[PDB]
């Protein structure tokens, strides 16, 4: 709910990665395997190659039943870890003849996932049992139902009675800049913030000594201060955050005060499309471990170097309200490998989405595409609605063409001919034509267009005559006249006349596309 | 320039009278011709202040089409003779400019006395404002 | 703290535009051929009207100035005028300076008291209203939009015009260069029915708060009401139909026991003339 | 299988599509008003024997929608292109024509537009002395011009006309939950008959919240809890509509809650036959 | 328990254009998410009839100590200066920052003439509302004028003017076009036949105040003047809901105004109800 | 800065024409009553234009008493296209030159523009006479 602004979401997204490693590293030790046996692990989805003994399958049922019964009490069925295995032969890895054995062996395994995601909690046996316990209540932050007395006061106010597992995630929400990794150790230890399904994770701070038998180390591959006896498990994570005047993670209400133009919170959530069809192209464990790692390091490592402001030779020029600052105010909440969710200053998230897509299109050799669903929400907005609307603006830009960006909430006719979210290349020429003639940069307008900000609202009123009646040509002369009276007959030559090429293609008229390119120019001024 | 005023007018005048009724085509044609109407009125002066009495006469009963009356007899009488009074008061070099603007509206007014009142006069009044609007865009007012 | 309710003195009357009246608002809304300076007209009838903001604003701005001049002696009559000095805050960008005109709207300075306790005693903002961070004294008068009288509706039915197009020109002193323009203004002599409701909240101070409304009106008859104004375009004159008290016992029961004052053929200066104790004498019996 | 469909034509905007247990608590609180106290416990014994209702589902101008079964997911590859295998699985509702096809495991089609639109309206809270704002958000289901919501009934008609058809006239004037003092849950009622063909087999999709006694075959789980007379109900593990049981009658759990009467929670299944794949 | 439901219908006539807004033209009115017709919320009309009836009682917290109990436990005024719930003063519920009159329990809310009708939460009690203020949408005459090319909203640009230098600082406000018709519906619930009478007298008293005041929006700049035209009074008895056989008490108020309905017709039109209760 | 108010000196009277008058080929008339009438702008814009010409010759006698007459030399900006310079008529309206002091404190010191009012860029000093029809 409307608590825990962005120190808390950023704590959850790394808490999920701890549970993702607390199971994989549990499988490796219990079966006698090293970290080479992990094929990949990114975004709540892993794959381990192991042996086929009768002894190991006894162990893998113990791992699974102990993970799920932890994930039922600690989270009231909101999260589920569906673990499936399938025995293969040796010849099943490489291709035989012309038939990909490794793909159909992966389809035998992915279907056992799909059945297990249906039987969502089968290995519980107290799942559908009913026992009425006296006087439970629910948490104000996360909404988990606990018995009374377990709800303890928070770290913000002693008035509210939050979960015990939230106060560990607000305290972790401050220890994120003061952090150099995690240490995996036993449950009944001192100094552990958060517990996983098999172990406990101690923070290894800035100034401190690592404790535990295995040490997760974020974003670096070199054992700097690590003892000789310990195991070095490197995990990468997209970790950019704008620091406040203190030594800490930014707020919702800091990012939007320091934005361009008016104040608003710019959420984007985009993901790679047709990626599950892409990993079936691979036909050996040498080939799939590579393709799931180069795809892994884009949203893990190379998205940090984009936000730091690099690679102008690769990217070029983006639709940008102002040139990129030295220390940008961007908070990477989550970025998984197929997916990302980035908040920030709402006119730099607008600039970043065309800067992520441009660098992704050269990281891949022009073969895979993104679908970014941009939203713009106020600071006083609960996050569970911001993720709800933006993910629906995502599936708006997903089901249409899978290579297209949503930019602004925009009104459309009820015919079906008019699809909302902009194609990537189609939009970035609408910025090249419309924006440098009505906008100059840094939140101000062109010459002699000031004291005519009423005009661009009137020009977006004539777009609202196209929506009640698409068949009318009332918008053609009203476009020409309003540019005439104001003396601005030179601007918008594409809008003053009808396009006979656009009628026969059954595509929208050029007054339909002008809504999103005008609003970004208009909202960047104080409007 | 003026060489466009000689060719495009004589291309359009035979298309003008052959569609004398105001209910010619509600499609893209009457807006495509209306730009060509102001295209050979561009090279002429075509001052609007003498037309302001006619357009306000079109304005004051445009509300009266809209649940005011169901009779546009008394209005459209006043539009016919005043538009003849336009050359009937103003002559000179502005007369040769205003003769070519006379020959488009006078076929359409005579429809409107016996026309429908909710219909076929809206189809005129939409062709009214298409002539004015582009005329501001080519450089006249 | 302590908002009460005792009734609503309703001032019914007719605004008579002695000179051409001009307000003006937006033009070209899905429309091409106009005079490009149209008085605001409501869309359902297409007739002009006097708004409430154009009358409450001009009754306010003629009553900041009266207070701004007599700021020195009214600190005893009204507290919280000791926070102020005569002048503007314009020379130094402060939302609370020593002077009177304290609040920046966009680029102009309009007196609005910052708190509920400060505006409760201020003569301006206790009547016309106020605002602030978290304190926010709301108004007492409801100035409603004025429309044409039963008579002048029919002069739009009979065929008489209601708007006139006046041509004014500008002239160079040297070359006599004519620089013309056109205005749409209300025809001189048209007549709008206004209504100003006064929400009586405290029976301690309504006599000195109705007198302030009839002071801002009696200045408006000598000043202009919107528009170009300094060149004749205002000159408005209040013709009072009826004062009515509308008491508290009226709203529950429904009995026609509302106290009606006698304002048949009286000027706005004649109500505030010696006789304000006699026109509103029977209001004292109800308190 | 001729079902007495009950159409609920909305006036104001609903707080939610009513769950099956939102309805039965609304109906029981109606019969405690228009029939006294003893008829409600008599109503509870009638649903124990034979009578069943379903959850509410939307309709858009006679085009009656129904929940998609979970029978189609384990062998959607045996049905039919990868883009089609996802957009068919992502859906939540199927049309009355297309719900019958997926019971027999035929290829089918999703609807194109959903009737309702969950919009969030901002409201405000104003103090009476200083007119000072205090905003809070609020969100509710907003239905279209023709569209609305319906649900089903199958059972003895002397239990229908004796109990439900009075209750759906009392519940047309006090809402089905939500802020029904802002005119939210109100509607007008018309009853109809509706026919769904079920293939005879021992597996069955449930058109209401299942709350099973034995573990089902394939189930989309759901956690919700109600509010009886200001008392919170505990969260219960219902199953969402469209899950597959074999020969399971469901149940109702009475709850204590510290009220004068006992409080039942409707979780009786609503079985319609289905053909399952191998697993 | 339950006895019947006095359903009030009629028409709301927004004589002067009114504005509500969504905070997203700078201040747009609320509309439907699909059709685009503006409307009046049920909350903007329940709460507005609550504020106007709250203040009237606030003046009469002394004189109504014999007609209503649980006003002896109140003194007039707010509780903003000391952030102290259920103190001696009247408006004793701080929602976020606004201090509103809400009674805290049941047996004081049953006697308090606001919380009995409009309803009050409090702690441990939750006495629900008794009225149901259903939304108001434009009359089918005005739904058709929406289809007849007429604009149902219009922008008014107001300005803010410097006192000395007379600069101009405009702003826009999208209002509903003046002269419109909304059809409303207010559905009272007859829970107790003892104070059956006063809730219809105390609801129509709040409409006598709403007709003189404004209905949301700028209001004091002129954007209210809502006017109530009644069309039907009903009763919908407990006999009606059991069987559906149409024998409900109907009172005719087809040309009756809201001050001609309180006492001019209140003994008259609700004479037929009093025998049935 | 500091707009105040002490009163309003009212100058009533009657304009008489001993010789025949014209305004503007009809003389414009009051529409509701039919009668001709002398407007407001033809009587305030005529007195200003017979006072900006009178001040133009005398910029040595009034400059000791009025400040912001030293900021102009007696002249015209009609040949030289400059907005605010030494010449006395400074505003090009569209094509005409009317003396308007471009600030509050210039018009507070000006003898013309403290009386017949003055526009400006963010100054906009307002008039002190209002001339009715
Ligand atoms: Zn919690
Ligand atoms: Zn003040
Ligand atoms: Zn109360
Ligand atoms: Zn000067």
Residues of C in contact with F6 (CB under 8 A): 69
Method of determination is: cryo-EM
Distance CA A351, CA C138 (A): 43
Cα angle: B8, vertex B14, B17; to 5 degrees: 125
Is any Cβ of chain A less than 8 angstroms from the Cβ of C28?
Answer: yes
Please, which residues have CB within 8 angstroms of residue A114's CB and are 6 or more apart in sequence? D73, D74
- Phi and psi, residue C129, nearest 5°: 120, 170
Question: By residue range, what is the domain housing residue B54?
Answer: 1-141
| Residue F36, beta-bridge partner list | F29
Query: How many C-beta neighbours within 10 Å does residue C224 have?
Result: 23
Please check whether residue A64 is in contact with residue A112, taking contact to mean a CB–CB distance below 8 angstroms. Answer: no
Distance CA A48, CA A39 (A): 6
Distance CA A316, CA E43 (A): 52
Helix (H, G, I), strand (E, B) or coil at A290: helix
Beta strands at C147-148 and C191-200: parallel, antiparallel or unpaired: antiparallel
Is any Cβ of chain B less than 8 angstroms from the Cβ of A478?
Answer: yes
Distance CA C178, CA C171 (A): 5
Is any Cβ of chain C less than 8 angstroms from the Cβ of D129?
Answer: yes
Beta strands at C236-244 and C260-261: parallel, antiparallel or unpaired: antiparallel
Which among D118, D1, D66 has a CA at the least distance from the CA of D241? Answer: D66
Sequential DSSP letters for B82-93 = HHHHHHHH--SH
Please check whether residue E101 is in contact with residue E89, taking contact to mean a CB–CB distance below 8 angstroms. Answer: no
| Residue B9, beta-bridge partner list | none
Query: How many C-beta neighbours within 10 Å does residue A380 have?
Result: 13
Sequential DSSP letters for chain E = ---B--EEEEEEEESS----------SPPPB-SSS--B-B-SHHHHHHHHHHHHHHHHHTTTTTTTTSSSSTT-EEEE-TTTT-TT-SEEE--BSSS-B----SSSTTTTTSTTTTTT-B-TTTT-B--S--EEEEEE-HHHHHHHHTT--SEEEEEEEEE-TTT--EEEEEEEEEPTTEEEEEEEE--B--STTHHHHHHHHHHHHHHHHHS--SSS-TTTT--EEEEEEEE---BHHHHHH-------EE-TT-BTTTTTTSSHHHHTHHHHTT-
- Give whole-number Cα distances, A222 to A18, A236, A424, A518, D257, in Å: 20, 13, 39, 49, 59
| Residue A334, beta-bridge partner list | A341
Q: How far is the CA of E69 from the centre of ligand 3 (A)?
A: 10
Beta strands at F73-76 and F87-89: parallel, antiparallel or unpaired: parallel
- Give whole-number Cα distances, D34 to D6, E89, E131, E239, in Å: 19, 40, 19, 9
Beta strands at A404-405 and A182-185: parallel, antiparallel or unpaired: unpaired
Question: By residue range, what is the domain housing residue C200?
Answer: 1-287
Which among C234, C201, C219 has a CA at the least distance from the CA of C120? Answer: C201
Distance CA D210, CA D233 (A): 17
Residues of F with CB under 8 A from a CB of C: 1-6, 8, 10, 28, 30-33, 39-41, 44-45, 49, 52-53, 56, 76, 78, 89, 93-99, 117, 122, 126-127, 129-133
* Residues by chain with Cβ below 5 Å of ion ligand 1: A 139, 141-142, 162-163, 166
Helices A514-524 and A424-438, axial angle in degrees (round to 10): 50
Please check whether residue A67 is in contact with residue A198, taking contact to mean a CB–CB distance below 8 angstroms. Answer: yes
Is any Cβ of chain C less than 8 angstroms from the Cβ of A458?
Answer: yes
Helix (H, G, I), strand (E, B) or coil at A380: coil
Q: Tell me if there are at least 3 CB pairs under 8 Å linking chains A and D.
A: yes
SS3 annotation, E140-180: HHHHHHHHCCCCCEEEEEEEEECCCCCCEEEEEEEEECCCE
Helix (H) / strand (E) containing A503 = helix A500-504
**Residue found under tokens 């000196």:** F9
Distance CA A33, CA A42 (A): 19
Distance CA C280, CA F66 (A): 50
Helix (H, G, I), strand (E, B) or coil at A146: strand
The residue of C170, C184, C233 whose CB has the most chain F CBs within 10 angstroms, and thus the best one to mutate to test that interface, is C170
Distance CA E172, CA E19 (A): 11
Tell me what percent of chain A is helix, strand and coil, each rounded to the nearest 5: 40, 15, 50
Which among B27, B59, B25, B29 has a CA at the least distance from the CA of B132? Answer: B59
SS3 annotation, A390-425: HHHHHHHCCCCCCCEEECCCCCCCCCCCCCCCEEHH
Which among D75, D73, D115 has a CA at the least distance from the CA of D90? Answer: D73
Å between A414 CA and nearest CA of chain D: 10
Distance CA D261, CA D229 (A): 11
Structure tokens, A6: 């962005």
Is any Cβ of chain A less than 8 angstroms from the Cβ of D145?
Answer: no
Decide if B31 and A477 are in contact by the 8 Å CB cutoff.
yes
Please check whether residue A271 is in contact with residue A340, taking contact to mean a CB–CB distance below 8 angstroms. Answer: yes
Give the count of alpha carbons within 13 A of E210, CB side only.
27
Please, which residues have CB within 8 angstroms of residue C156's CB and are 6 or more apart in sequence? C47, C148, C162
Distance CA F41, CA F131 (A): 8
Query: What b/e readout covers A133-155, taking b as 16+ CB neighbours within 10 angstroms?
Result: eeebeebbbbebebeeeebeebb
Please check whether residue E220 is in contact with residue C56, taking contact to mean a CB–CB distance below 8 angstroms. Answer: yes
Distance CA D20, CA D266 (A): 7
**Residue found under tokens 């490009």:** C36
Q: How many domains is chain C partitioned into structurally?
A: 1
Nearest CA in chain E to D169: E241
Is any Cβ of chain A less than 8 angstroms from the Cβ of D262?
Answer: no
Terminal-to-terminal C-alpha distance of chain F:
31
Give the count of alpha carbons within 13 A of F36, CB side only.
9
Distance CA F101, CA F120 (A): 7
Give the count of alpha carbons within 13 A of E106, CB side only.
7
Structure tokens, E195: 């104070």
Structure tokens, C100: 């009177």
Decide if B52 and C32 are in contact by the 8 Å CB cutoff.
no
Which among A383, A353, A361, A467 has a CA at the least distance from the CA of A417? Answer: A467
Please, which residues have CB within 8 angstroms of residue D214's CB and are 6 or more apart in sequence? D248
Please, which residues have CB within 8 angstroms of residue C47's CB and are 6 or more apart in sequence? C41, C147, C148, C153, C156, C162
Helices and strands: H and E segment counts in chain A: 18, 19
Distance CA C113, CA C91 (A): 19
Which among A5, A22, A44, A30 has a CA at the least distance from the CA of A194? Answer: A22
Q: How far is the CA of C135 from the centre of ligand 2 (A)?
A: 13
Distance CA E264, CA E250 (A): 17
The residue of E160, E169, E217 whose CB has the most chain C CBs within 10 angstroms, and thus the best one to mutate to test that interface, is E160
- Give whole-number Cα distances, A37 to A21, A23, A48, A285, A500, in Å: 14, 14, 6, 10, 61
Distance CA A347, CA A350 (A): 5
Structure tokens, E254: 């087809």
Please check whether residue E223 is in contact with residue D147, taking contact to mean a CB–CB distance below 8 angstroms. Answer: no
Please, which residues have CB within 8 angstroms of residue F79's CB and are 6 or more apart in sequence? none
Q: What is the DSSP letter of A304?
A: H
Distance CA F100, CA F92 (A): 10
Please, which residues have CB within 8 angstroms of residue A230's CB and are 6 or more apart in sequence? A210, A212, A213, A214, A215
Please, which residues have CB within 8 angstroms of residue A6's CB and are 6 or more apart in sequence? A249, A250, A251, A252, A331, A333, A343
Helices A474-485 and B122-137, axial angle in degrees (round to 10): 40
Distance CA E20, CA E219 (A): 10
Return the beta strands (E) in A326-393 as ranges. Answer: 330-335, 339-344, 370-374
Å between C283 CA and nearest CA of chain D: 25
Distance CA C122, CA D47 (A): 70
Residues of E in contact with C4 (CB under 8 A): 55, 58-59, 76
Structure tokens, A4: 């825990």
Helix (H, G, I), strand (E, B) or coil at A287: helix
Which among A490, A506, A460, A475 has a CA at the least distance from the CA of B31? Answer: A475
- Give whole-number Cα distances, E9 to C211, D145, E264, in Å: 42, 21, 18
Å between D81 CA and nearest CA of chain A: 11
Please check whether residue C114 is in contact with residue C135, taking contact to mean a CB–CB distance below 8 angstroms. Answer: yes
Distance CA E106, CA C281 (A): 46
Q: What is the DSSP letter of C242?
A: E
Residue E115, annotated ligand binder? yes
> Count of A–B CB contacts within 8 Å?
33
Helices (H), A36-153: 54-68, 70-73, 101-118
* Residues by chain with Cβ below 5 Å of ion ligand 2: C 113, 122, 124-125
Please check whether residue B34 is in contact with residue B127, taking contact to mean a CB–CB distance below 8 angstroms. Answer: yes
Please check whether residue A296 is in contact with residue A337, taking contact to mean a CB–CB distance below 8 angstroms. Answer: yes
Helix (H, G, I), strand (E, B) or coil at D269: coil
Structure tokens, E253: 């108020």
**Residue found under tokens 């009644």:** E230
Å between E110 CA and nearest CA of chain D: 17
Sequential DSSP letters for D166-211 = HHHHHTTTS-SSSSTTTT-S-EEEEEEEEE------SEEEESS---
Please, which residues have CB within 8 angstroms of residue A60's CB and are 6 or more apart in sequence? A27, A31, A83, A85
Residue E87, annotated ligand binder? no
**Residue found under tokens 């009478």:** E197
Please check whether residue C186 is in contact with residue C54, taking contact to mean a CB–CB distance below 8 angstroms. Answer: no
Which among C248, C262, C235 has a CA at the least distance from the CA of C12? Answer: C262
Residues of C in contact with B63 (CB under 8 A): 46
Please check whether residue A329 is in contact with residue A348, taking contact to mean a CB–CB distance below 8 angstroms. Answer: yes
Residue F99, annotated ligand binder? yes
| Residue A194, beta-bridge partner list | A201
Which among C168, B98, C27 has a CA at the least distance from the CA of A485? Answer: C27
Distance CA C127, CA A254 (A): 39
Query: Could you say which of C5, C25, C144 has the minimum Cβ distance to residue E222?
Result: C144
Query: Could you say which of C33, C46, C165 has the minimum Cβ distance to residue B132?
Result: C33
Return the beta strands (E) in chain D as ranges. Answer: 2-10, 52-53, 57-60, 63-67, 93-95, 117-124, 135-142, 148-151, 153-154, 187-195, 203-206, 221-224, 227-228, 231-232, 236-239, 244-246, 253-255, 263-265, 271-274
Which among B26, C33, E154 has a CA at the least distance from the CA of A472? Answer: B26
Q: How many domains is chain B partitioned into structurally?
A: 1
Cα angle: A53, vertex A56, A60; to 5 degrees: 140
Structure tokens, A189: 């230890």
Residues of C in contact with A482 (CB under 8 A): 28
Q: What is the DSSP letter of A470?
A: S
Q: Tell me if there are at least 3 CB pairs under 8 Å linking chains D and B.
A: no
Sequential DSSP letters for C60-99 = HHHHHHHHHHTTTTTTTTSTT-TT-EEEESTTS--SS-SE
Query: What b/e readout covers B54-92, taking b as 16+ CB neighbours within 10 angstroms?
Result: bbbbbbbbbbbbbeeeeebeebbeebeebbeebbeeeee
Dmax (CA) for chain B in angstroms is 47
Dmax (CA) for chain D in angstroms is 69
Query: What b/e readout covers E45-67, taking b as 16+ CB neighbours within 10 angstroms?
Result: bbbbbbbbbbbbbbbbbeeeeee
Please check whether residue A267 is in contact with residue A390, taking contact to mean a CB–CB distance below 8 angstroms. Answer: yes
């Amino acid at each position: 709910s409307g608590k825990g602004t962005l120190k808390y979401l950023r704590a959850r997204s790394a808490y999920l990665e701890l549970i993702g490693w607390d199971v994989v590293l549990e499988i490796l030790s219990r079966l006698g395997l090293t970290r080479a046996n992990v094929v990949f692990n990114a975004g709540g989805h892993f794959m381990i190659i192991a042996q086929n003994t009768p002894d190991a399958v006894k162990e893998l049922e113990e791992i699974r039943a102990k993970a799920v019964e932890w994930l039922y009490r600690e989270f009231e069925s909101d999260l589920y870890l569906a673990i499936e295995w399938e025995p293969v032969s040796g010849r099943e890895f490489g291709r035989e003849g012309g038939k990909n054995l490794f793909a159909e062996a992966r389809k035998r395994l992915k279907h056992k996932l799909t059945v297990r995601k249906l039987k969502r909690f089968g290995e519980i046996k107290g799942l559908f049992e009913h026992g009425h316990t006296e006087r439970l209540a629910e948490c104000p932050v996360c909404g988990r139902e606990l018995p009374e007395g377990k709800l303890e006061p928070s770290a913000s106010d002693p008035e509210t009675k939050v979960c015990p597992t939230c106060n560990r995630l607000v305290s972790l929400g401050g220890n994120l800049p003061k952090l150099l990794g995690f240490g995996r150790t036993a449950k009944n230890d001192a100094g552990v913030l958060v517990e996983g399904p098999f172990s406990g994770f101690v923070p290894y701070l800035q100034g401190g000594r690592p404790v535990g038998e295995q040490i997760l180390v974020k974003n670096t591959l070199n054992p700097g201060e690590i003892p000789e006896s310990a195991q070095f498990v490197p995990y990468f994570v997209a970790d950019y955050f704008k620091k406040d005047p203190k030594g800490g993670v930014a707020t919702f209400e800091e990012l939007s005060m320091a934005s361009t133009g008016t104040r608003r919170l710019g959420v984007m959530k985009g993901d790679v499309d047709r990626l599950g069809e892409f990993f079936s192209s691979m036909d050996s464990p040498s080939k799939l471990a590579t393709a799931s790692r180069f795809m892994d390091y884009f949203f893990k490592g190379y998205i940090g170097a984009i936000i730091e402001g690099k690679f102008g030779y690769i990217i070029g020029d983006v639709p940008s309200l102002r040139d990129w600052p030295e220390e940008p105010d961007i908070v990477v909440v989550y970025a998984g490998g197929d997916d990302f969710f980035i908040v920030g200053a709402w006119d730099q998230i607008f600039e970043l989405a065309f800067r992520v897509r441009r660098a992704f299109n050269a990281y891949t050799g022009g073969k895979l595409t993104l679908s970014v669903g941009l939203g713009y929400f106020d600071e006083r907005t609960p996050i569970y609605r911001m993720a709800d609307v933006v993910s629906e603006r995502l599936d708006t830009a997903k089901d249409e063409g899978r290579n297209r960006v949503f930019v602004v909430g925009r009104s459309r006719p009820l015919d079906g001919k008019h699809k909302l979210s902009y194609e990537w290349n189609h939009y970035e020429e609408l910025w090249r034509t419309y924006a440098p003639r009505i906008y100059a940069g840094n939140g101000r307008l062109k010459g002699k267009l000031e004291s005519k900000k009423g005009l661009l609202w009137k020009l977006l009123e004539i777009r609202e005559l196209y929506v009640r009646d698409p068949n009318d040509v009332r918008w053609a002369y009203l476009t020409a006249y309003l540019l005439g009276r104001h003396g601005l007959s030179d601007l918008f030559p594409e809008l003053v006349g009808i396009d006979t090429k656009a009628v026969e293609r059954k595509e929208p008229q050029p007054v339909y596309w002008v809504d999103g390119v005008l609003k970004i120019v208009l909202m960047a001024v104080r409007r | 320039k003026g060489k466009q005023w000689e060719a495009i007018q004589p291309y359009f005048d035979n298309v003008v009278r052959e569609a004398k009724n105001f209910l010619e085509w509600s499609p893209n044609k009457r807006l495509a011709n209306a730009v060509t109407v102001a295209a050979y009125l561009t090279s002429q002066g075509l001052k609007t202040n003498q037309v302001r009495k006619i357009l306000d006469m079109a304005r004051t009963t445009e509300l009266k089409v809209k649940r005011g009356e169901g009779d546009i007899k008394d209005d459209l009488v006043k539009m016919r003779y005043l538009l003849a009074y336009t050359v009937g008061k103003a002559t000179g070099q502005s007369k040769y400019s205003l003769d070519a603007f006379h020959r488009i509206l006078d076929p359409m007014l005579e429809v409107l006395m016996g026309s429908p009142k909710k219909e076929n006069f809206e189809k005129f009044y939409d062709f009214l404002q298409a002539v004015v609007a582009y005329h501001k865009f080519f450089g006249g007012g | 703290m302590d908002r009460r309710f005792y009734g609503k003195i309703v001032i019914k009357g007719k605004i008579k535009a002695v000179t051409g009246l001009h307000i003006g608002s937006q033009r070209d809304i899905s429309e091409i051929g106009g005079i490009a300076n149209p008085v605001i007209k409501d869309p359902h009838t297409g007739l002009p009207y006097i708004p409430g903001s154009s009358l409450k604003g001009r009754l306010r701005s003629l009553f900041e100035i009266l207070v701004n001049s007599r700021l020195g002696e009214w600190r005893e009559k009204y507290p919280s005028l000791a926070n102020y000095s005569p002048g503007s805050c314009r020379p130094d960008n402060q939302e609370n300076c020593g002077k009177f005109f304290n609040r920046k709207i966009n680029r102009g300075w309009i007196h609005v008291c910052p708190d509920y306790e400060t505006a409760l005693a201020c003569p301006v903002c206790r009547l016309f209203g106020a605002s602030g961070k978290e304190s926010n004294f709301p108004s007492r008068i409801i100035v409603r939009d004025a429309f044409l009288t039963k008579e002048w509706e029919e002069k739009w039915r009979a065929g008489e015009a209601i708007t006139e197009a006046k041509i004014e020109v500008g002239i160079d002193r040297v070359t006599s260069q004519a620089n013309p323009r056109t205005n749409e203004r209300v025809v001189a002599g048209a007549e709008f029915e206004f209504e100003i409701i006064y929400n009586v909240e405290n029976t301690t101070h309504w006599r000195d708060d109705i007198k302030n409304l009839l002071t801002a009106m009696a200045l408006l008859e000598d000043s202009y009401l919107g528009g170009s104004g300094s060149r004749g375009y205002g000159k408005v004159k209040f013709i009072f139909d009826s004062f009515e008290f509308r008491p508290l016992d009226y709203y529950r029961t429904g009995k026609d026991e509302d106290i009606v004052s006698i304002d048949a053929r009286e000027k706005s200066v004649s109500d505030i003339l010696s006789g304000f104790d006699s026109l509103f004498s029977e209001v004292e019996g109800k308190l | 299988p001729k079902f007495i469909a009950v159409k609920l034509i909305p006036k104001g905007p609903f707080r939610d599509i009513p769950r099956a247990d939102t309805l039965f608590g609304a109906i029981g609180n109606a019969i405690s008003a228009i029939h006294g106290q003893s008829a409600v416990e008599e109503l509870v014994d009638a649903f124990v024997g034979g009578a069943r209702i379903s959850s509410a589902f939307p309709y858009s101008g006679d085009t009656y929608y129904l929940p998609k079964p979970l029978s189609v997911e384990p062998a959607l590859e045996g049905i039919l292109r990868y883009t089609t295998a996802k957009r068919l699985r992502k859906a939540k509702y199927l049309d009355l024509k297309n719900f019958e096809l997926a019971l027999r495991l035929r290829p089918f089609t999703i609807p194109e537009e959903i009737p309702y639109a969950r919009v969030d309206v901002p409201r405000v809270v104003l103090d009476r002395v200083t007119q000072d704002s205090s905003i809070y958000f609020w969100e509710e289901i907003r239905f279209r011009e023709k569209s609305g919501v319906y649900f089903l009934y199958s059972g003895p008609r002397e239990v229908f006309d004796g109990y439900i058809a009075p209750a759906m006239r009392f519940l047309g004037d006090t809402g089905i939950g939500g802020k029904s003092t802002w005119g939210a849950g109100l509607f007008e009622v018309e009853f109809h008959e509706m026919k769904i063909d079920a293939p005879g087999s021992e597996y069955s999709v449930t058109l209401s919240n299942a709350l099973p006694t034995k573990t089902p075959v394939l189930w989309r789980l759901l956690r919700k809890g109600g509010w009886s007379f200001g008392r919170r109900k505990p969260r219960m593990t219902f199953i969402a509509e469209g899950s597959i049981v074999k020969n399971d009658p469901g149940g109702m759990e009475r709850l204590e809650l510290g009220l004068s009467h006992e409080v039942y929670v409707y979780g009786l299944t609503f079985p319609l036959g289905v053909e399952l794949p191998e697993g």
